[PDB]
Amino acid sequence: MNIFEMLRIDEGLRLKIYKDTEGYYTIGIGHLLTKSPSLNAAKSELDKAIGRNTNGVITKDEAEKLFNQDVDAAVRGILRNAKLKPVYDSLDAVRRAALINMIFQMGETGVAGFTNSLRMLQQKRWDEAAVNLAKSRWYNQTPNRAKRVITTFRTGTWDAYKNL
Questions:
Q1: Range of the domain at 158
Q2: Which listed residue (5, 10, 20, 92) is catalytic?
């Protein structure tokens, strides 16, 4: 268990281009390709990102490389966000992955809005943070995933991912 496996499970890994919920071309582990409605355009973007003429199809390895790039971007983002940096800075390794998981799902700005829960996490008030997060829209919208992430924050272990 590592971040890649965690996200592969939570977000799912797609080897072919598809449309996200906002109707935007995406691939791999939730990797947004473009907001253009043009598939050719998405295809061009994809080849660039993968560094291969893929004709809209990628390998798991290529998805992982892609994923790493996103993680890196997420980390740089966190590091320039006054609401997230302090929490991230305080978190142990597994909890960091749980936070990055959230960013993958909702975007940095969206995660940064969980003001109170973030504070609790920074304070190491695990159960309190868990209870607070269980009240969220996010929890009620994608409960299975949210519950896994929450359990990860509560325990600091990968326990929620052991038997899926």
A1: 1-164
A2: 20
